[PDB]
């Protein structure tokens, strides 16, 4: 029941965690997947036959973002059950804490792709509850291993907060995050308020106004302000310490940025 590798597009990937693929498939230790419809197969011969006839060239759902070669597709788990189940089983090979794979109907899946000389390739995704009463704007979030640590994850995170902004909600990723996902959110949260603070020249700020603009949860903002040693306390008032050390170090960084004007989507 342990899968060791998968064949995905032009990549062969070592898998990290158990995923409940049907035991008829799991016991072979290796899976061959169509990179477009996410069907999993037993042999590369079967895969080759499938790609020769597979009609899919991109995720289902509606393309709700496009800038250059980057797309985001909104996939309703109730309307594309099989695709989303295959997506969740694939994700479980690389996420330890994901627990839902088959009951995809409560979820929306936001799938990010890159178009290139071969095709329109899966970069990663995040799932999202259609009704989160705990204000999670992300359930699970992942980049494929061949695109990790290359700025794509930051785009995915930014897109999740872009949706929250349009919804006029504040949100947070559901916990526990993967190791890399927590590392990525902390770095993204730091960059976000450095841009806010660089673009802001009032002299007093509430957590609320930062949260309202960025859609970042107040808890995440304060812990980031403490992580950056910018949250100080003198007499009876809490202060924010503008380290231009950081706004300049951040200013030296720059494409892999989401363009809000390229979003065609309403709640």
């Amino acid at each position: 029941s342990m899968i060791k590798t998968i064949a995905f597009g032009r990549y062969e990937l070592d898998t990290w965690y158990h995923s409940p693929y049907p035991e008829e498939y799991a016991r072979l230790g290796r899976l061959y997947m169509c990179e477009f419809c996410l069907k999993y197969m037993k042999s590369q011969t079967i895969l080759r036959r499938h790609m020769a006839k597979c009609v899919w060239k991109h995720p289902p759902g509606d393309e709700i973002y496009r800038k250059g070669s980057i797309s985001v597709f909104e996939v309703d788990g109730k309307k594309n059950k099989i695709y989303c189940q295959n997506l969740c089983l694939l994700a479980k090979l690389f996420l330890d804490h994901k627990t839902l794979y088959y009951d995809v109907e409560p979820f929306l899946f936001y799938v990010m792709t890159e178009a290139d000389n071969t095709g329109c390739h899966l970069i990663g995704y995040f799932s999202k509850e259609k009704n989160s009463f705990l204000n999670y704007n992300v359930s699970c979030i992942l980049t494929m291993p061949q695109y990790m640590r290359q700025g794509y994850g930051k785009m995915l995170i930014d897109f999740s907060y872009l949706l929250s902004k349009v919804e006029e909600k504040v949100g947070s990723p559901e916990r526990p995050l993967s190791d890399l996902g927590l590392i990525s959110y902390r770095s993204y949260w730091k960059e976000v308020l450095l841009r806010y603070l660089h673009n802001f020249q009032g002299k007093e700020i509430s957590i609320k106004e930062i949260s309202q603009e960025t859609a970042v949860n107040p808890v995440d903002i304060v812990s980031t302000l403490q992580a950056l040693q910018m949250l100080k306390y003198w007499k009876g008032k809490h202060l924010v310490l503008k380290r231009q050390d950081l706004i300049d170090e951040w200013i030296a960084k720059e494409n892999k940025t989401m363009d809000p004007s390229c979003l065609k989507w309403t709640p």
Binding site: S206, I207, K208, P218, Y233, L239, V240, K242, Q244
Partner: peptide
């Protein structure tokens, strides 16, 4: 609408003066 962080609690609505 408050945050507990260490060892006191903040209000989301209080203006925090920015300094150097």
């Amino acid at each position: 609408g408050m945050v507990e962080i260490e060892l006191h609690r903040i209000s989301i609505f209080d203006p925090l003066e920015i300094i150097l």
